[PDB]
């Protein structure tokens, strides 16, 4: 189930000069230790950590086919290894620039890539661990016009008879307030299939609530997952945690 993991989304706002520092300092501390985040959704990551190693695993994703690179990234030392898995999408079509990444405490059984009907969009990428799927996305910066389509393509893919048993959770930068997304979905007649999980505070300095999560309502114990804003790091986007409430 989704609540079994410590999930988190963060928009790096990456650049050729800051990205490595952001991986090695900020991302490391969010992930480190057994209490560290298990699943991390990352946006604007044009590069993986320099110390990450290619696994050479050829990924055939569900949905559509873009090249997804798998990496191992040791957060421990030589005498004590803590290996995490990174799933990175960089180049899309001739337009390129996806810059999405998902970091996992374990190796994905399956990978997903879904393309929303808005052709200007970056794809949606995900990994499957057992009966759970974790996806990330990064809607366009013009008020997130494709955010609803991003949710819709996700909803429709997992509604397929073979896919209905899966719990899926989507988190990333929607570039649009949670209120409006619920209105968009309401207009799309999809507002009740999912539940939007957002922090109460803004996630971008400015600024509004752009970074949050969406959980399929048929996911068992989905109502336990709470969006909690994390202390700011080295971007203008606050990381947002999705944790199970105490019980």
């Amino acid at each position: 189930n989704i609540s079994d993991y410590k999930v988190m989304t963060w928009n790096l706002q990456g650049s050729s000069a800051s990205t490595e520092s952001k991986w090695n300092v900020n991302v490391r501390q969010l992930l480190s230790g057994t209490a560290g985040v298990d699943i991390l959704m990352v946006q604007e990551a044009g590069a993986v950590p320099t110390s990450a190693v290619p696994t050479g695993r050829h990924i055939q994703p569900f949905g559509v086919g873009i090249p997804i690179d798998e990496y191992t990234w040791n957060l421990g030392t030589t005498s004590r290894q803590d290996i995490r898995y990174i799933y990175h999408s960089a180049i899309d079509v001739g337009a390129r620039r996806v810059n999405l990444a998902i970091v996992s405490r374990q190796r994905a059984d399956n990978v997903y890539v879904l393309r929303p009907t808005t052709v200007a969009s970056r794809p949606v990428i995900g990994i499957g661990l057992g009966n759970d799927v974790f996806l990330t996305a990064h809607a366009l910066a013009s008020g997130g016009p494709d955010a609803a389509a991003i949710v819709r393509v996700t909803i429709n893919f997992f509604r397929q008879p073979q896919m209905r048993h899966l719990s899926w959770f989507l988190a990333g930068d929607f570039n649009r307030s949670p209120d409006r997304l619920e209105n968009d979905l309401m207009t799309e007649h999809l507002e009740r299939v999912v539940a939007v999980l957002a922090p109460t505070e803004p996630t971008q300095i400015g600024g509004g609530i752009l970074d949050y999560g969406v959980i399929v309502d048929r996911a068992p114990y989905s109502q336990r997952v709470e969006a909690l804003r994390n202390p700011q790091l080295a971007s203008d986007h606050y990381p947002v945690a999705f944790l199970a409430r105490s019980c």
């Binding site: 189930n1 609540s3 079994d4 410590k6 057994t34 209490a35 405490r105 374990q106 057992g130 009966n131 048993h165 068992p220 114990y221 109502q223 336990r224 944790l243 199970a244 105490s246 019980c247």
Partner: protein
Amino acid sequence: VDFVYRVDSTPPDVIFRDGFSLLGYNRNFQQFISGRSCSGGSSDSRYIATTSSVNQTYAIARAYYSRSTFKGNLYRYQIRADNNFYSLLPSITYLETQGGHFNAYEKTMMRLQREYVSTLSILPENIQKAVALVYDSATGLVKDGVSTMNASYLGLSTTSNPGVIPFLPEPQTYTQQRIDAFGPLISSCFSIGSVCHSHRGQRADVYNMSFYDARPVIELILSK
């Protein structure tokens, strides 16, 4: 082991819908076997305790039914074990090579449990059936009542994981901590309260079991 069990006061029509949820994110293994991360302690364990023993489920039910403050109904849920279900011993063994120590109370305790732990929540797909546990107050006898098949169950080809629980925390060399137990030396993690009862539309109360420290009890029977 192919199948394990839990006991719950939550009806089949609800459990078959939701399955069993972890209390929290506390991975500490020693805090789980002593019951410190379960419903009597910090209540945040990242494991669910099951048992391979049908008789232990009778004992769990008897420990609730024998209390005059308890009024509910209990069911045994048969669960198909997969690779997220682990026995205690390989993790006890591993943690010991990492400087950990388990005293004779903890080891006597674990031996009596026939316990397998799930690292993830337990899905409706793993839950094959529910059998009612019926109590004859006159005799103390516990018998199987009505049995109900779960339609959503998938008879997959899985079995329990024979290896070591992953992501185990390292500590600690010495603890001397309280061992929460109930009934005839049953680990508190088998309490109905040791899975998260967040069931939508189903606001029913869980009977709060009391626990005793099993160390002194075990010391008494170990003495003489």
